[PDB]
Design a protein around this ligand. Structure first.
Ligand SMILES: Nc1ncnc2c1ncn2[C@@H]1O[C@H](COP(=O)(O)OP(=O)(O)OP(=O)(O)O)[C@@H](O)[C@H]1O
Ligand SMILES: Nc1ncnc2c1ncn2[C@@H]1O[C@H](COP(=O)(O)OP(=O)(O)O)[C@@H](O)[C@H]1O
Lengths: 441, 884
């Protein structure tokens, strides 16, 4: 039954294709780690802890809930079967009625009544699947040497692999592509690391999929050698023989906003006080728009992808504006228009997204006497007797002391709570419908 | 032998004649000398492949010669003494110069340029040296025209005398410069009315000069008035600004032109400012090309292109077709005084790309999504390499595995039509999505430049009318209501103003003449209702009695019927061939197309007294090689195709008849894009024919091209919009009209009494009943009865003609019965002759019950023997077949 469910997952998307030798090796790991009920529980726990990290968050929740449902359907009675079925139905708003009356089931009904859909979905992992796996646990408990780390856009695993290499004290080599010189350098580095070992990083190989078809099929036990390649979940299809011979890892984008601001401002290494203040505001706005990007049903209407390139171009534009102004009168309207209708609206092909981006620009680049960028904290205007280092210290201090609230997706992005609750309800409906399609078939 | 001799003479003129060029390939030149002394084709081809490195060095000597292939370039090199074959192919060099006048050069559209000084010519001068000298000379001529125009304008001289002497480019950018300076001087104070009035009287005086000018002066003046309307609009907007912040923002958004007053250089002395962003003017001659009407969204596109190109990253457009991306790119490029090459969608593409990156010009890609995976990947990799080399500031780039120099001003532009580019391109490109351009502003400014007294209101009305047409009419394949159709309508308004005058009537009449032929029937009624409801003019009928009388005379001469639908189609074809050159006639099968244009030919031959020559040609019957030509690769021999032979014979004009006659070449077959893209150069306003050998055969103005087709599923909208499209919604006749025309035709192919009896016997009362009864009958290979009337007539009248030898010895009743029986048999074997036997007997019963019981009832096996009415039972001959 578990293998049938995983075959369905592999049929849903081209990245989830699960082999059979992997399943048998996971079953071997069940006994390796340290009566029939205990063996079955260890089977379920080990299979989830091995095959969760090869899926995205939505399919993670789907597989967790389906595994809990199958275990409770086989172990518990018919009343709990009907209760679980009707809770899954009311999650998708298909079956209406209270479950038959269990402390944990009462907690589920309390969470459903309070419309906390993400907590209801994560309750299964909170209750049954106690153990969790990160990227380090996957790479440490893997016998292979070739790894694929795919993810969505608006995020990258370069810093995560940097942290992993620092943790393992291994010299990593990030190899960007784009030129035949880059391809030759990557080939030479591969031919070197196939002898002397070492961790080698490959990034955004979907554009070089043709080079993959040319070289990797013909190419594919050294110590401290693990080849990493990064793909995109929305990209082109990778070859199946390449995918079956490697371990698959999916990374999740961070949910915070202040962390993004800190990460952006920690790389803007320097133009005096005004340039630094402009770069600070630009980092805040890039973080806010990147946070609003993922909210596809309500905040936006289409999943755009604002990388750091448009932030860099906006920084260049602000530098050029600040250079040609000796009167200390910043043209707020000009920079607002250029950000709204060229920089962060050039790729936009819809009117409503342009209007909301312009509204956010007016909210951020107003240049008021005392701006309230978020309801939590207010950034005062700089004074007229400061150098660059004093302003940098002041901005870092005013960045550190801020508190990220639990409603950052509503208060900081200026959205009604009903929209976010509707988005979460739609996600719950999708998860429940998918797990029903897994159940009845 | 001939090919070897020609190649030997060409290579001798290339390498043997000139000295000190054989050092790069000494062994190859020695082999060439040995084969020349011996005189082979294979050795010559191998040498010319080995001479590509020498050819590459030759193209590196003057990079502007790279734009041609091997054959054209070797033709250029061989004719290095007579100073010929170079000026003829000058169009492919710069795109805005057609020929060389050394006194000067002449533009593609027809503008002459005068050099600052003459350049000495000798028979021992290689092409590259004087080509580069001519390029420097024309650039310096543009610079000195800039400086003397600035001196004259700052002196106080009016624009009307400057515009009549210098080039449009110089006066245009001088007016831009002085407009920037005086708007700045107005910005240092709070006064804007005086410069607004000054540019207003400047526009009015330029219009007064325009209305009595020649063709080139009219084009140049319009190309100046578009920017002067821009200046008027900008100053009017700046005057309307409440605060100085809005004025500063609007002035930073729009383009500004500045000239450095301290740099000793000339080409690096004029820069363009927009929101603090600097771009370098190139000062390349462009002539008087098409100037886009300026809109605020055009300025936004200009601003985002400038913002992208400041950081050494090219621009990239994407959006629905018809929003004006490629024309926006072209206007931006020629606004900087440089020519942007245009790619229409691998070896030739990569060669053009490496030539672009080694010349430093701009590359524009149109409709990027029609490439295969391999060529798309290779082109994306090449563009990524070029752009990374530009970003890294590399003097040379490793593009296509050759070391070629990289200019810092090279840019690549790509347009897309989504409903995509790879990851590497989008990592190094900026995307812009323009909306629907304001057709109100374009229409208003083109109407103001055409002198319409009511411009804004009429433009709003016409764009609202086009929106209503697009939102109400059917969703046919060939229906285009974008900006192309509006621009074509307002262009075709130009010849109509001499008879209808400026105002609503000319716009309504041109709207009819352009839109109405291309619509169906319910679409035509919707168009008429919307035109009556929105526009005030009711469309009074003009005085055209002579032409309709001539059409009626030609129709009665050829036996045709003058039904009002046929008159409407004839008038549409005549008014559409008055202006448009290449016409397309579309309708159902056998709906009266060839008859229509033949009637038009006869009628206006009568009307004008002008001779007509017709060359009927089927498109699909002849192959591509036989239609135009076939370069015989065995000996590089040229065999002229039928159309090209006709064009050469009409260009030669040995008899001199074609100087006083009209020549039509119809194309009576289904349209093939492979057969129409080969003559796209004839299609547009260029009116020139390209050939595989490179000849540019001109087309006389009376040399018309026609197309006849039954469908438009396999025809591109590009040729549809450029052609005048005539649509036959229904048949142009009645059944009685066609039956009478066929009877008259076969009569031409007691005789008067017989003709009267035949014409009276085809009484429409029972004929319509039996025709609508047979229309409900199942016919194999189902064709309309309108296509069976021909069979019916040609069978019946031939039977009567063959039986005419026994028509003087029988009674009137017997003759009537014989005629009726023959007619019944003919209509049986024409209408229901393609149906089953039971249905044939049913149609026999229907004929008998619908022609009356008094008439002779035709039996299922009846016949006439030599005369009496017999049955087919008696004519069966018994056969005695043998054993084996
Ligand atoms: N008044 C008329 N106007 C037009 N056609 C007529 C008229 N009277 C008769 N005809 C018929 O039109 C025929 C001429 O061909 P027609 O123009 O109808 O075909 P077509 O549409 O050009 O054909 P194709 O589709 O094969 O190219 C004549 O043979 C005749 O039978
Ligand atoms: N400012 C302008 N002036 C004149 N025509 C314009 C302007 N902007 C857009 N157009 C129109 O854009 C249309 C062509 O652009 P488009 O169809 O996008 O090119 P492509 O088909 O190569 O994508 C033409 O109808 C042209 O009239």
């Amino acid at each position: 039954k578990i293998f049938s469910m995983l075959e369905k997952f592999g049929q849903f998307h081209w990245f989830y294709g699960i082999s059979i030798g992997q399943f048998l090796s996971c079953f071997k790991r069940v006994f390796i780690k340290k009566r029939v009920d205990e063996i079955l529980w260890l089977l379920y726990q080990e299979v989830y802890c091995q095959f969760s990290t090869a899926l995205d968050k939505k399919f993670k929740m789907i597989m967790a809930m389906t595994m809990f449902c199958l275990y409770k359907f086989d172990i518990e009675s018919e009343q709990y079967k009907e209760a679980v079925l009707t809770m899954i139905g009311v999650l998708s708003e298909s079956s209406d009625g209270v479950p038959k009356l269990n402390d944990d089931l009462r907690y589920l009904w309390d969470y459903v009544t309070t419309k906390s859909y993400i907590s209801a979905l994560n309750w299964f992992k909170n209750e049954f699947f106690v153990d969790e796996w990160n990227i380090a646990d996957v790479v440490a408990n893997s016998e292979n040497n070739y790894f694929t780390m795919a993810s969505e856009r608006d995020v990258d695993g370069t810093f995560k692999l940097i942290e992993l290499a620092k943790a393992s004290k291994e010299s990593l080599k990030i190899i960007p592509l784009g030129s035949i010189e880059n391809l030759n350098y990557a080939q030479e580095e591969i031919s070197k690391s196939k002898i002397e070992g070492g961790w080698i990083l490959l990034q955004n190989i979907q554009m070089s999929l043709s080079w993959v078809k040319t070289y990797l099929h013909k190419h594919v036990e050294h110590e401290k050698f693990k080849m990493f390649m990064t793909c995109h979940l929305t990209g082109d299809k990778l070859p199946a023989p390449l995918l079956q011979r490697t371990d698959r890892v999916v990374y999740e984008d961070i949910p915070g906003i202040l962390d993004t601001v800190k990460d952006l401002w920690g790389s803007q290494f320097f133009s005096g006080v005004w340039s630094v203040y402009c770069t600070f505001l630009l980092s805040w706005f890039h973080a806010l728009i990147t946070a609003r990007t993922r909210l596809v049903p309500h905040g936006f209407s289409k999943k755009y992808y604002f990388n750091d390139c448009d932030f860099q171009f906006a920084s260049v534009y602000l530098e050029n504006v600040l250079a040609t102004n000796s009167t200390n009168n910043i043209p707020w309207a000009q920079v607002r228009d250029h950000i709204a209708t060229i920089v962060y609206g050039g790729k936009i092909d819809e009117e409503k997204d342009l209007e909301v981006v312009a509204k956010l620009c007016a909210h951020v680049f107003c240049g008021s006497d005392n701006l309230q960028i978020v309801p939590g904290v207010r950034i005062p205007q700089p004074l007229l007797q400061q150098s660059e280092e004093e302003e940098r210290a002041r901005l870092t201090a005013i960045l550190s002391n801020t508190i990220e609230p639990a409603d950052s997706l509503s208060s900081w992005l200026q959205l009604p709570r009903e929209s976010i609750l509707d988005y979460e309800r739609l996600q719950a409906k999708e998860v429940a419908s998918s797990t029903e399609q897994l159940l009845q078939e | 032998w001939v090919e070897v001799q020609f190649y030997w003479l060409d290579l001798y003129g290339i390498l043997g004649e000139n000295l000190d060029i054989q050092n790069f390939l000494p062994l190859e030149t020695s082999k060439f000398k040995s084969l020349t002394s011996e005189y082979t084709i294979d050795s010559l081809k191998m040498i010319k492949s080995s001479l590509s490195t020498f050819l590459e060095r030759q193209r590196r000597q003057f990079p502007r010669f790279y734009f041609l292939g091997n054959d054209d370039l070797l033709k250029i090199i061989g004719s290095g003494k007579h100073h010929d074959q170079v000026s003829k192919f000058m169009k492919k060099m710069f795109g805005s110069i057609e020929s060389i006048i050394i006194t000067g050069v002449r533009s593609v559209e027809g503008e002459v340029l005068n050099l600052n000084e003459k350049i000495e010519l000798k028979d021992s001068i290689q092409a590259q040296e004087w080509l580069n000298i001519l390029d420097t000379e024309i650039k310096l001529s543009v610079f000195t025209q800039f400086r003397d125009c600035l001196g004259q304008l700052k002196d106080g001289t009016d624009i009307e005398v400057v515009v009549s002497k210098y080039i449009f480019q110089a006066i245009l950018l001088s007016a831009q410069v002085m407009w920037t300076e005086l708007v700045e001087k107005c910005l240092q104070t709070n006064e804007f009315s005086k410069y607004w009035k000054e540019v207003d009287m400047k526009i009015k005086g330029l219009l007064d000069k325009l209305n009595k000018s020649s063709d080139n002066v009219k084009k140049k003046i319009e190309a100046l008035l578009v920017e002067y309307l821009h200046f008027n609009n900008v100053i009017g907007q700046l005057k309307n600004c409440s605060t100085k912040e809005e004025a500063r923002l609007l002035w930073a958004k729009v383009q500004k032109f500045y000239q450095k007053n301290d740099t000793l250089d000339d080409l690096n002395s004029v820069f363009i400012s927009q929101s603090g962003y600097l771009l370098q003017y190139k000062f390349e001659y462009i002539g008087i090309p098409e100037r886009l009407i300026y809109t605020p969204l055009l300025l936004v596109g200009f601003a985002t292109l400038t913002d992208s190109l400041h950081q050494k990253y090219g621009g990239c457009f994407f959006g629905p077709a018809g929003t004006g991306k490629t024309e926006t790119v072209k206007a931006f490029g020629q606004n900087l005084g440089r020519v942007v090459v245009v790619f229409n969608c691998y070896q030739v593409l990569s060669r053009l790309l490496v030539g672009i990156t080694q010349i430093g010009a701009w590359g524009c890609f149109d409709e990027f999504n029609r490439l295969d995976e391999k060529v798309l990947s290779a082109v994306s990799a090449n563009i990524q390499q070029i752009q990374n080399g530009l970003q890294v500031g590399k003097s040379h780039i490793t593009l296509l595995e050759e070391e070629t120099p990289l200019s810092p001003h090279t840019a690549v532009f790509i347009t897309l039509n989504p409903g995509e580019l790879p990851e590497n391109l989008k990592k190094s490109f900026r995307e812009f999505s323009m909306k629907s351009p304001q057709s109100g502003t374009i229409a208003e400014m083109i109407l103001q430049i055409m002198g319409f007294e009511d411009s804004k209101s009429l433009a709003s009305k016409i764009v609202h009318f086009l929106e209503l047409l697009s939102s109400k009419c059917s969703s046919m394949n060939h229906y285009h209501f974008g900006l192309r159709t509006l621009k074509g309508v307002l262009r075709n308004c130009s010849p109509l103003v001499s008879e209808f005058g400026e105002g609503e009537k000319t716009v309504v009449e041109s709207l009819k003449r352009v839109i109405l032929p291309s619509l169906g029937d319910t679409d035509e009624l919707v168009f008429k209702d919307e035109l009556s409801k929105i526009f005030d003019s009711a469309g009074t009928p003009l005085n055209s009695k002579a032409i309709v009388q001539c059409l009626k005379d030609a129709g009665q001469r050829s036996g045709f019927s003058m039904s009002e639908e046929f008159l409407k189609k004839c008038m549409q074809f005549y008014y559409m061939q008055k202006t448009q050159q290449a016409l397309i006639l579309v309708g159902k099968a056998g709906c009266g197309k060839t008859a229509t244009w033949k009637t038009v030919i006869d009628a206006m031959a009568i009307f004008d007294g002008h001779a007509n020559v017709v060359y009927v040609i089927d498109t699909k019957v002849l192959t591509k090689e036989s239609l135009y030509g076939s370069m015989l690769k065995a000996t590089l021999e040229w065999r002229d195709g039928l159309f090209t032979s006709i064009l050469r014979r009409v260009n030669d004009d040995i008899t001199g008849t074609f100087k006083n006659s009209r020549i039509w070449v119809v194309f009576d077959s289904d349209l093939d894009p492979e057969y129409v893209e080969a003559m796209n150069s004839v299609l547009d306003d260029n009116k020139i024919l390209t050939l595989p050998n490179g000849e540019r055969l001109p087309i006389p103005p009376n040399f018309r091209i026609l197309f006849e087709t039954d469908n438009l599923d396999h025809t591109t909208p590009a040729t549809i919009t450029r052609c005048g499209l005539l649509w036959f919604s229904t048949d142009v006749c009645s059944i009685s009209s066609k039956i009478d025309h066929l009877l008259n035709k076969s009569y031409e192919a007691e005789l008067d009494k017989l003709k009267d009896l035949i014409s009276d016997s085809f009484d429409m009362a029972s004929l319509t009943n039996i025709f609508t009864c047979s229309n409900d009958l199942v016919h194999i290979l189902g064709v309309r009865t309108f296509n069976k009337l021909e069979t019916a007539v040609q069978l019946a009248v031939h039977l009567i003609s063959s039986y005419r030898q026994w028509f003087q010895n029988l009674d009137d009743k017997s003759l009537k019965d014989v005629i009726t029986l023959l007619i019944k048999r003919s209509l049986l074997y024409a209408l229901a002759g393609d149906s089953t036997g039971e249905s044939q007997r049913a149609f026999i019963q229907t004929i008998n019950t619908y022609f009356g019981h008094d008439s002779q009832e035709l039996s299922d096996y009846s016949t006439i023997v030599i005369l009496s009415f017999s049955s087919f039972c008696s004519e069966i001959p018994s056969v005695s077949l043998e054993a084996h």
